[PDB]
Amino acid sequence: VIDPSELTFVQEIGSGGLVHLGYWLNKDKVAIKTIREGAMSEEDFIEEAEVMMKLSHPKLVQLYGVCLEQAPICLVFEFMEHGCLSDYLRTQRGLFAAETLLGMCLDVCEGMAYLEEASVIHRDLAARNCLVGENQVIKVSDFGFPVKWASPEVFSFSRYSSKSDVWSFGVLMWEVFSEGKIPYENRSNSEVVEDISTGFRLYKPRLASTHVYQIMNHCWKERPEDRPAFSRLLRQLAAI
Numbered sequence: 001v002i003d004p005s006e007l008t009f010v011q012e013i014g015s016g017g018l019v020h021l022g023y024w025l026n027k028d029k030v031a032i033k034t035i036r037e038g039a040m041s042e043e044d045f046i047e048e049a050e051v052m053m054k055l056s057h058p059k060l061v062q063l064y065g066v067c068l069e070q071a072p073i074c075l076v077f078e079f080m081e082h083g084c085l086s087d088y089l090r091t092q093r094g095l096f097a098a099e100t101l102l103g104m105c106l107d108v109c110e111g112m113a114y115l116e117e118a119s120v121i122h123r124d125l126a127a128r129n130c131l132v133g134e135n136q137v138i139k140v141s142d143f144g145f146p147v148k149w150a151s152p153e154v155f156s157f158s159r160y161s162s163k164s165d166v167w168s169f170g171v172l173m174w175e176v177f178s179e180g181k182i183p184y185e186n187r188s189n190s191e192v193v194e195d196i197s198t199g200f201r202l203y204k205p206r207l208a209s210t211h212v213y214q215i216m217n218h219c220w221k222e223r224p225e226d227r228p229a230f231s232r233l234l235r236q237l238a239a240i
């Protein structure tokens with residue numbers, strides 16, 4: 001529990017919740033997330049915190065604490081210098097070597113393999129939900145309808161698992177290797193459901209080798225039983 005007097009709100013850096021750049025004990029930068037008017041409840045925030053406060057891994061954005069004596073309450077996170085991965089890919093497009101893109105996927109895979117070990121389902125993995133830090137390190141952002149990133153059992157039946165996160169991770173790999181292109185030419189959710197149900201899959205980005213592309217396709221097997229766990233993907237990505 002963080003006392004409100006320990007935080008300084010500097011400026012807005014995000015909204016959709018609201019996020020501010022702040023300082024913690026007037027020295028260190030933090031990202032302070034507050035609930036948006038009434039978009040979501042405080043109990044939801046509390047549930048996120050109860051999950052995230054038990055977790056710590058270098059490729060997961062860290063939740064430092066909760067400020068209970070704010071109205072509404074706020075969550076205090078690790079500040080990620082360069083913002084969201086989706087914007088970063090798009091903004092720096094044409095400057096990335098394949099090896100760099102691979103390293104970004106490995107970062108995320110490491111975060112996700114930790115979540116998998118910890119029995120936590122992300123449920124909304126996407127480049128827009130990854131952040132870029134110092135030295136271009138990628139970290140997975142917070143957790144606790146996006147059809148374009150959803151496995152067929154998720155879009156059809158809300159059947160979430162680590163294996164549905166695997167499907168999402170395959171799409172994220174496609175985003176990374178495509179330098180922030182929007183999956184499925186930004187087709188509608190109805191059309192994407194129809195695409196994936198019939199067996200359509202995303203085509204190979206230029207910067208993805210044949211080998212990388214087969215790992216992506218493995219992530220997009222129709223049955224979750226047929227997709228690799230994150231522990232197995234991590235060994236595959238690390239061996240490249």
Ligand SMILES: CN(C)CC[C@@H](c1ccccc1)n1cc(NC(=O)c2n[nH]c3c2CCC(C)(C)C3)cn1
Pocket residue numbers: 013014019021031032033061077078079080081082083084087131141142
């Ligand atoms: C140039 N532009 C692309 C990046 C600008 C950058 C920034 C912002 C203010 C002061 C210095 C640098 N910036 C850095 C962020 N970081 C975050 O939004 C962030 N850092 N940690 C978290 C978040 C957003 C999501 C979170 C769950 C609150 C955790 C946003 N903008």
